[PDB]
Write a protein that binds this ligand. Structure first.
Ligand code: HEM
Ligand SMILES: *[C@@H]1O[C@H](CO)[C@@H](O[C@@H]2O[C@H](CO)[C@@H](O)[C@H](O)[C@H]2NC(C)=O)[C@H](O)[C@H]1NC(C)=O
Ligand SMILES: [Ca+2]
Ligand SMILES: [Ca+2]
Ligand SMILES: [Mn+2]
Length: 357
């Protein structure tokens, strides 16, 4: 087909997503892998995972836009703390681009947001999800303090995800920060390159922890290897769950396998996301609008490296059957501060709308 902008799309139904992509970029993303983009990528996951095979349809419909359709319900569950911001930022587009369902909107937005992160893959995007569903039940969102067994069971029950797919999905923590784990500090990065979709997170979680970014008494948080922060440049935080998955016999080798394996990591994430994005739907009933997802930003192609002040001596390895690669170390005696803004500064407030959530 061909859209009113000359763009030759696959199916005429996909044409509506072109104006939406432009509006999302211009209004809330500004073509960067920033705060607003990160929040949306997280929403994509919280919307999709609220489904349960064992409990049945009444428990939740998966990737159905329930967070937007029932804004006063799920956003208020403990495990969803902080999701309100992404919901309120997306509602205005729902009302505007009213030919696209809340569910399609959520998934597409995440695909657009991710394309702003260098190294991220171009996600598959299928459209046609219904604009009607039910509010999900509490307890279907995995938490930081959960054990590996509980986590793996949750993903299996949601959509038959194997442990390999679960680890692959955590590649998103390479462009993630925390605002609610510790209430004394904001935007504490999970890896040293929070604006880059690379393998640093897999490497950095394997390093010995030496301190904490803020308080040392937070549920679901463990010692970080790069806690130093000054002003707005908050230090790195480490989640119990990420730590646990990096050292459990079931997932240890998978986790290590992604260190310095950029192409493998990106492809595995794309694969796992294809499944996640259609939870609660039959993919044979959705149209393929992938050619409408923006081309992602390319990476520089540099290998993973130990950040300044850490080295091979600081690794806590758990995979006995695979050789850890030889990586270089960035020069310096002390830890460098992790930039709060992608441009380098400390002042870069994102757009935020008031809403019902
Ligand atoms: C065992 C599974 C997971 C757990 C327990 C978990 C936990 C968390 C926690 C505690 C935060 C901090 C939020 C805050 O306090 O502000 C976070 C952030 C985030 N997570 Fe996860 N996560 C999991 C899986 C995923 C998956 C599968 C995705 C998506 C594909 C994802 C994407 C994100 C993103 C992008 C953020 C950052 C939001 C921002 O920087 O504003 N997470 N996660
Ligand atoms: C999907 O459902 C939502 C929720 O009912 C619809 O949102 C309304 O859209 C109109 C314009 O079409 C706005 O004036 C309303 O205020 C919206 N309601 C809310 C609560 O936000 C949306 O239009 C529906 N879209 C589709 C494609 O079915
Ligand atoms: Ca949902
Ligand atoms: Ca990163
Ligand atoms: Mn945040």
């Amino acid at each position: 087909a061909v859209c009113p902008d000359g763009t030759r799309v696959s199916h005429a139904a996909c044409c509506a997503f072109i104006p939406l992509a432009q509006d999302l970029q211009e209004t809330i993303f500004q073509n960067e892998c920033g705060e607003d983009a990160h929040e949306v990528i997280r929403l994509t996951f919280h919307d999709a995972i609220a489904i349960s095979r064992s409990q049945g349809p009444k428990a939740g419909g998966g990737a159905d836009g329930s967070m937007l359709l029932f804004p006063t319900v799920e956003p208020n569950f403990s495990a969803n703390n902080g999701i309100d911001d992404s919901v309120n930022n997306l509602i205005p587009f729902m009302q505007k681009h009213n030919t696209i369902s809340a569910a399609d909107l959520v998934q597409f937005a995440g695909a657009v947001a991710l394309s702003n992160c260098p190294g991220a893959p171009r996600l598959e995007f299928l459209a046609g999800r219904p604009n009607k569903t039910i509010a999900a039940v509490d307890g279907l969102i995995p938490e930081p303090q959960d054990s590996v067994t509980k986590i793996l069971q949750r993903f299996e029950d949601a959509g038959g995800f194997t442990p390999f797919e679960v680890v692959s999905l955590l590649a998103s923590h390479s462009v993630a920060r925390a605002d609610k784990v510790d209430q004394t500090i904001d935007a504490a990065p999970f890896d040293s390159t929070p604006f880059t979709f690379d393998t640093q997170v897999f490497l950095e979680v394997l390093l010995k922890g030496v301190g904490f970014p803020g308080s040392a008494n937070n549920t679901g948080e463990v010692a970080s290897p790069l806690p130093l922060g000054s002003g707005s440049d908050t230090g790195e935080m480490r989640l119990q769950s990420d730590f646990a998955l990096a050292h459990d016999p079931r997932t240890a080798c998978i986790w290590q396998g992604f260190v310095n394996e950029q192409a493998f990591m990106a492809a595995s994430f794309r694969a796992a996301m294809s499944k996640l994005a259609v939870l609660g739907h039959n993919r044979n009933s959705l149209i393929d609008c992938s050619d409408v997802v923006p081309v992602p930003k390319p990476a520089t192609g540099q290998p993973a490296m130990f950040p300044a002040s850490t080295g091979p001596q600081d690794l806590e390895l758990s995979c006995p059957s695979e050789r850890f690669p030889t990586l270089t170390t960035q020069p310096g005696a002390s830890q460098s501060l992790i930039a709060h803004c992608p441009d380098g500064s400390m002042s870069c407030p994102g757009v935020q709308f008031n809403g019902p959530a």
